[PDB]
Design a protein around this nucleic acid. Structure first.
Ligand SMILES: Cc1cc2nc3c(=O)[nH]c(=O)nc-3n(C[C@H](O)[C@H](O)[C@H](O)COP(=O)(O)OP(=O)(O)OC[C@H]3O[C@@H](n4cnc5c(N)ncnc54)[C@H](O)[C@@H]3O)c2cc1C
Length: 456
DNA sequence: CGGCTCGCGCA
DNA sequence: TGCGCGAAGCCGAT
């Protein structure tokens, strides 16, 4: 589809047809950014060879009622900044409200689009929208992987059992797909208010707000500034101040040594390929670079491999055969404790370490990467069944995490509860052969009293 | 067959 | 804190 700096393996055809005489339409969803976006670049390249302008369309769905204000404001404020960025490049952006299966097909017919492009997401609801759009349009429909360094359908053609089998496949394709991004050329031709959608949506989510006793909100919004510009600053400070000590202080929740990039990486406000490009060129601790590259490349893209090849990624059926047989045998085991969804949500357990972990989630929207393991595994230990544990963890993870509703979450929860991408460990009660984490094990690895005292 | 992103005993 | 071992089931390189 033309291009010199454009690898054709990044784009695949969802529907064939005669290319219309209208503008090229980029259905933006996962990658909400103007820079370092292969989908927006491939849309501009197709627009250049056809001598037509490119436009961006974003469909705001009713999915925001399932989450809260913390994710709604973080995403909508970045789209307000993105609207100004695309305007400087003469790219007009259109924001629709409703079902994408019906709104995109109507926008395509109304604007007389010539070609339709969208980004890649392995989630179930995205494939449902794509099949609805294919049946309602008659122009070519393409899909570009702008979230992974190596395209998901190109890195592996099957479900990967572990990371030690996915690691050689990914790193073998890095010299081809790891490249610099070309600049977004502005439009040569020419062709709802986001402020009202923000005030309307916030007023609908106000009753469901997380509060404390004196009716004060629990969420602290000053920890992470949303937007494409702020995501660049978070990367720069991480490379300059936090990348050196990353390899040694990554599992210490009392130290702020993480990249803090998952809120921006989830909404697509920053390209993970851009982060890899800068980390590769940075002269820092070699063990710290290898530890970070293993996270943002192997573990981030293998979660896309998990959801894309297992349509029941949020279910007990996606668990391996050894894990399902172990969890099934311990179904009748008496639990030491039993808490419901409301008691897990308010942090009213007997474990001050688990409660402090839940408080960091409710107040900042980003639980530390290490405690999220202990947070999820203790749910399986103090719940009715593995299905209820999977249901409570997914609920709290997608409702209060800023990086929630992400393929990393369903793969991370399945790792902690179902042992996905893990192996079997010592036999125990209730949990069986699933990996076990203890409060005493965290006491020997970091100052637990400091973590508890920080979040009450 | 070899090696996989815990708890535990011991410097 | 840092290291070596234990307990476990299975992939995949042959
Ligand atoms: C039960 C559970 C639930 C999770 N929930 C989510 C979620 O909803 N959204 C989410 O983005 N991550 C989730 N993860 C992964 C992990 O908790 C976050 O990626 C990380 O804590 C975010 O902080 P960070 O970006 O500063 O981490 P860093 O150490 O800076 O990691 C850098 C990047 O690497 C990737 N990464 C790191 N660790 C993992 C991992 N274990 N799996 C996959 N990718 C990883 C992420 O893209 C992250 O932004 C979850 C993990 C677990 C165990």
């Amino acid at each position: 589809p033309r291009g010199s700096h454009m690898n054709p393996k990044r784009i695949r055809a969802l529907k064939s047809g005669k290319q219309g005489d209208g503008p090229v339409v980029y259905w933006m969803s996962r990658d909400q950014r103007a820079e370092d976006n292969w989908a927006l670049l491939f849309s501009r390249a197709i627009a250049k060879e056809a001598n037509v302008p490119v436009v961006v369309v974003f469909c705001l769905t009713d999915e925001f009622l399932e989450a809260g204000i913390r994710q709604y404001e973080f995403m909508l404020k970045g789209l307000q900044e993105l609207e100004v960025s695309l305007s400087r490049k003469k790219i007009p952006s259109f924001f629709l409200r409703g079902d994408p299966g019906e709104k995109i097909s109507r926008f395509v017919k109304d604007y007389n689009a010539g070609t339709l492009v969208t980004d890649f997401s392995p989630l179930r609801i995205k494939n449902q929208w794509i099949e609805k759009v294919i049946s309602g349009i008659s122009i070519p429909f393409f899909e570009v992987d702008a979230h992974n360094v190596v395209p998901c359908w190109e890195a592996s053609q099957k479900h990967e059992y572990a990371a030690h089998t996915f690691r050689p496949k990914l790193y073998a394709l890095l010299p081809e797909f790891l490249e610099e991004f070309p600049e977004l050329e502005p439009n040569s031709v020419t062709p709802e208010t986001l402020s009202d959608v923000l005030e309307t949506g916030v007023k609908a989510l106000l009753p469901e707000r997380a509060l404390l006793k004196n009716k004060d909100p629990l969420f602290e919004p000053w920890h992470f500034e949303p937007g494409e510009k702020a995501a660049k600053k978070v990367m720069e400070s991480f490379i300059a101040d936090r990348l050196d000590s990353y390899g040694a202080l990554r599992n210490d929740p009392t130290k702020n040594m993480l990249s803090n990039l998952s809120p921006y990486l989830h909404f697509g406000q920053i390209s993970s390929q851009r982060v890899v490009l800068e980390v590769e060129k940075a002269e820092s601790n070699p063990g710290s670079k290898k530890a970070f590259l293993d996270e943002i490349l192997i573990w981030k893209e293998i979660s896309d491999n998990f959801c894309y090849y297992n349509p029941g990624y949020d279910g007990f059926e996606s668990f391996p055969s050894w894990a399902k047989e172990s969890l099934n045998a311990h179904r009748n085991d008496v639990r030491s404790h039993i808490y419901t969804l409301e008691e897990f949500e308010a942090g009213k357990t007997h474990d001050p370490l688990w409660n402090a972990s839940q408080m960091e989630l409710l107040s900042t929207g980003k639980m530390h990467g290490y405690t999220r393991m202990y947070w999820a595994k203790k749910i399986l230990e103090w719940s009715e069944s593995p299905e209820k544990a999977l249901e409570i963890a997914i609920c709290l993870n997608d409702r209060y995490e800023l990086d929630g509703r992400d393929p990393n979450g369903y793969a991370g929860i399945a790792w902690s509860i179902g042992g996905v991408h893990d192996r079997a460990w010592g036999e125990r009660e209730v949990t069986g052969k699933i990996r076990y984490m203890s409060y005493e094990g965290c006491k020997r690895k970091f100052d637990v009293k400091l973590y508890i005292e920080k979040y009450s």
